[PDB]
Symmetry: C4
């Protein structure tokens, strides 16, 4: 096997087709499904799998009580076959911890899990299913990373981490790994003022990450990484189509180099594909809560501060719960271009549905089509009353 190189561009995105869906919460009402959150999707050369952070209990288990909580000793990064649910019996543990990323470099997979108390967390970098490198907290305040796949180019897999305040300036670092070893790291540069939970994809030897400004911004910060030079830039999506949550209503002119204000100290992980006219943004439909999900085609969103939608697709109705969302692609597919994909975490339980004592999610995932396909909506599908 050789290291994968990002030699292709994105396929033209004219619509999105259904790729995977696990129905985990429906199925786990009566089967041994692990409680999760922070899911994602990631491909190896021969298989694509679902990933998430387990809470180390089943949904129906008494230990599901309290699983709104983020960072326990009972969490792990797990993977499981595409569109199956994360069960006790089919879930493979990649590493232990409560914040993660993972990617395949074409030879083997790197997985990163962070664990520890808030003031003393550490990353362990796994390569070829063995621990290779460890990184201690630099700011002693919840060292944390992407919660979706990283991307590699010629063996170099950049990863974005943050350590420090979630509601103020923090210390974000881009690490450049190869075979699980640190080649280099850099502090965040450019005009993004706060970075969380980057969602990344690669094309033509450039990695683009769309992140969450949890501090001030309802526009999303974007980091663009050159994995050969091992350098990067940052800015915000210029478009007035604002894509964090919660957020203010859309203005007519956005901000390229500044957080678009109105909402502080909150957000949600999200993603975009930023490719000139072939630009699509995901967001919650609601401006107030993690409900609904839609894709909007917003030509030149990254660079055009008045760019508005020219096309769209509803993924999840506004009357259904959504959650995190992130990018991945099958870098090992056939053909001449990389097909954009994404997932949405469909959160069930607390805090929105507090008649149950748990928090979990299921997954829906879609990839782009060059057709203009009909749209459906893809809810979680579980009846919460069944769990009472």
């Amino acid at each position: 096997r050789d290291f994968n190189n990002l030699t292709k561009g994105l396929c033209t995105i004219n619509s999105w087709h259904i790729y995977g869906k696990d129905n985990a919460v429906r199925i786990g009402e009566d089967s041994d499904v692990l409680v999760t959150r922070e899911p994602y999707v990631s491909c190896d050369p021969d298989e694509c799998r679902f990933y998430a952070l387990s809470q180390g209990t089943t949904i129906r288990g008494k230990h599901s009580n309290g699983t709104i909580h983020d960072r326990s000793q009972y969490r792990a990064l797990i993977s499981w076959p595409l569109s199956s649910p994360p069960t006790v019996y089919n879930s493979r543990v990649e590493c232990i911890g409560w914040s993660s990323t993972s990617c395949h470099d074409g030879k083997t997979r790197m997985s990163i899990c962070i664990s520890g108390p808030n003031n003393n967390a550490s990353a362990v970098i796994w390569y070829n299913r063995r621990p290779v490198t460890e990184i201690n907290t630099w700011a002693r305040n919840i060292l944390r990373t992407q919660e979706s796949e990283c991307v590699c180019h010629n063996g170099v897999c950049p990863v974005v981490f943050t350590d420090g305040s979630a509601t103020g300036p923090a210390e974000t670092r881009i690490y450049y790994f190869k075979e699980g070893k640190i080649l280099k790291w850099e502090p965040l540069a450019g005009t993004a003022k706060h970075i969380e939970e980057c969602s990344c994809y690669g094309e033509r030897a450039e990695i683009t990450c769309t992140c969450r400004d949890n501090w001030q911004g309802s526009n999303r910060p974007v980091i663009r990484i050159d994995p050969v030079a091992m350098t990067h830039t940052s800015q915000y999506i210029c478009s007035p189509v604002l894509t964090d949550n919660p957020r203010p209503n859309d203005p007519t002119v956005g901000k390229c180099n500044d957080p678009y204000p109105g909402n502080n100290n909150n957000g949600v992980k999200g993603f975009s594909y930023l490719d000139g006219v072939n630009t699509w943004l995901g967001r919650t439909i609601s401006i107030a809560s993690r409900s609904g999900y839609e894709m909007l085609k917003v030509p030149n969103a990254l660079t055009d501060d008045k760019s508005k939608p020219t096309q769209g697709q509803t993924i999840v109705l506004n009357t259904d719960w959504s959650g995190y969302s992130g990018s991945f692609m099958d870098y090992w597919a056939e053909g001449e271009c990389y097909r954009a994909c994404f997932y949405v975490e469909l959160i069930r339980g607390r805090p929105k549905e507090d008649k149950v004592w748990w928090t979990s999610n299921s997954i829906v995932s879609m990839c782009s089509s060059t057709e203009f396909l009909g749209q459906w909506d893809w809810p979680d599908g579980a009846k919460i009353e069944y769990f009472l």
Copy 2:
């Protein structure tokens, strides 16, 4: 691996032997078995598997309530090891949707799943477990396909789809795929007036599909496909042994080029092997309901409008529930001829057994013998009262 070619003829069918049976409904009374319907069987070069459309819940799960319904966002094409039940933990998801087909071309497998609302459905064609092609609804009325295996020849895998009314003229298309790409499609031609749910098999470089005329016909339409020329014909089985359900009583002369009338706007998926004197037809024993199942040897059924049975075999007693049935063969077996096989879907629950709130099925499957074997009957075997 090279593409499989249909170089052999059918083995002489003198009786049917038991091939597989999953007992899914019996076993799922107390284990984590998924609710299904629309099952089938399909072989790879090294393994044969059961397939079906999951309902995204277990039988015993509270989400089983309402699973009579056909087309939800919670359905997927699943496969699982031959004669095992479709469990949460052993079922592999092929694609998401509520109508499907799948076949192996000798190199890898193509799987097709259709999803969406009634007026905006789309097919996604998977090849080598990756999405390759998408097809939008052309008639905006429940785009839909075979619900059993397709067949390939030298890499060309024809698939029959219908879009439009189920009770009137519709727009049926034969698509010719290779490596998940569209080579060609053609509208239905010939004298079949309505096509649903084709059941196909191949021999000597010809693919024969027996389908369901849901509109007017209680004789079954037959499509015969030349996968080299990528052309086809259609007609009806001429025999007065009528093989849809519900149906009128058997006449003494059938119809070759016209629906045999008497029952409108209903049917059931079924199959036949049409091979001169080596012709066997499957049907429900009941003319009114999906109960019982039998095979009848009906020499020259396709072409002889007075052909009557010369031999038969009971598969399921008339006092037991049946369901859909379809053809498959192990194209990769040893020997000089292709052994005809079929499955029967043994539907349990609604609408016939409405003391439960679910609908599911198990599978029985048989292949032909050159012996004249003794017959048994093969019911589902679950006691519905246990589920109350």
Copy 3:
């Protein structure tokens, strides 16, 4: 891979060591374990597995009620990893039916399952996990076979079948298979008057089967097969150490060519290793019921009508339930000799334990040692009161 040849002799048997044990009934009290009976063990070149006839329900399932019954449409030959229990999720179905045998020829495995009603049963012979040959009932009275592994030599795998009365003369046949095809069959010859359920092993190009004379004999019939010549002999074990069940008390002189009388129309599957002074016989400890199990070293049991034990080993106490027992060996092990092995079926439930409505078993299995090892006893270990 080449066909295995029986080139080695038996290892000297000085005691028996524990080989496998599944604890199935203990574990299935609270996990999804299939009801079984008629278990055995059989090796492939790279793995040894447990086998049995499923009843197509879990123990705890409501469908367990009635599983004393032998021959339903819901039974199948299953295999599963050594010493695991037969679960819904780990059990591989080899074929469908209610009487079986299976063996690996060094290239691939042959599995045979018989199904049907009593007057119309048929064997299907599977090779390389595909059906190849079918055999119809010749006597129309419960066509049936070994219920333990067959043995192969240079691709020829003899199998013993019986069809006809269980309490009178019947029609026993030795079939010689190769690649699942019939080379030859012969009717039983020699002085055994009735044959059931043969337990076989091979050494130095001879296959020895110890069987059950269900009609008149409490000594066990022995068939010895030359798989090159495809010929056989039969007689009884001459020893007065009688090894069927139920049985009369041991006399001082047995019978070589005649059933030893006293008990009619009953028996149990069992086995022996017949190798001159290296001869060991298994039997129930009880003369009346399937309770206890012991191995006795009985030099020249086959040929010496006064041979008595010189050594022994208790396997199951007389205060614990036993069941069927049978021979197998790992023909693909290292070293200079074939290590004798056996299993005992530990039957629980009906008819002996009729406060439950089911019948099932677990498995214990032992292989020979050239040491003189200490003995333990190996009960099933489940508490029946837990299942009430």
Copy 4:
């Protein structure tokens, strides 16, 4: 594959990072998790797995009652994927018995399980998943072994066994195996007065075992084995940092060649890494019970009778239950040195938590870092009240 050679030294241990954790007791509250104790970890060249002695029942099963008991016929050595729980459906049985060890020699794995009654136990040595050698009890008093991984060098895998009193002189033997055969055995020599449950690791062609003096010593005996010469020495850890449990308070001067007295006839399996200044000792935090766990860096512990800690790491708080602990390494990892690893058995249930009727455990495991990482604590995490 070639036999692994112990060519590398230990990596510098500056802290410990989380490696694996199964959360078995939390998860098994509502899934089919086997009851275990005596767990460990062991690597093959391509995978690292958890191991333990099953009790042949699930936690939630009624057969969990009585599982404080050590030596039943229902126990087996099982392995399962790293950080998964030991479930009915994912656990592979290595051999049957109630005391074990296992190691991979670079070509294949050797597994040893001892079974039998107290006065007549026997070891079966498995190699390449087949039984090869058997050893009968020599002292007729609970023949028993390591309960953690053995280590191999050029195919020679030494194993320590004890037979005889647990509270007095016993007969300890070092066996040297290759391909599951006995090359040699030696009686214990040197100044260790009693040996139980050795925990071993290899580096630079030397194997170091830290064991449990159950009779008189609260310092741990150490056996050092030359696997080329097939010879060994024994002594005690000289350090006054005493590491058995229960134990007296730490003195200021320990004992090199004598048990450090104060506590008799009890202990716990434990481990150390003894590598000059790079020496780390594990122990319970409590001197009275199996509660808490910590690692202490104790330069020259083996040889310096006044050596005290220079660094440490808390693994399990003193308010949480611990248990056995043992060493393993991934001998097949990349890089220039062997990374020290260990596990801790987190015992739940009896005798400490006697409102439940069972005894089980989960596993936590850590490996060394050359960083100085932040510490967390890693409890079992189950709420016992949930099981009432």
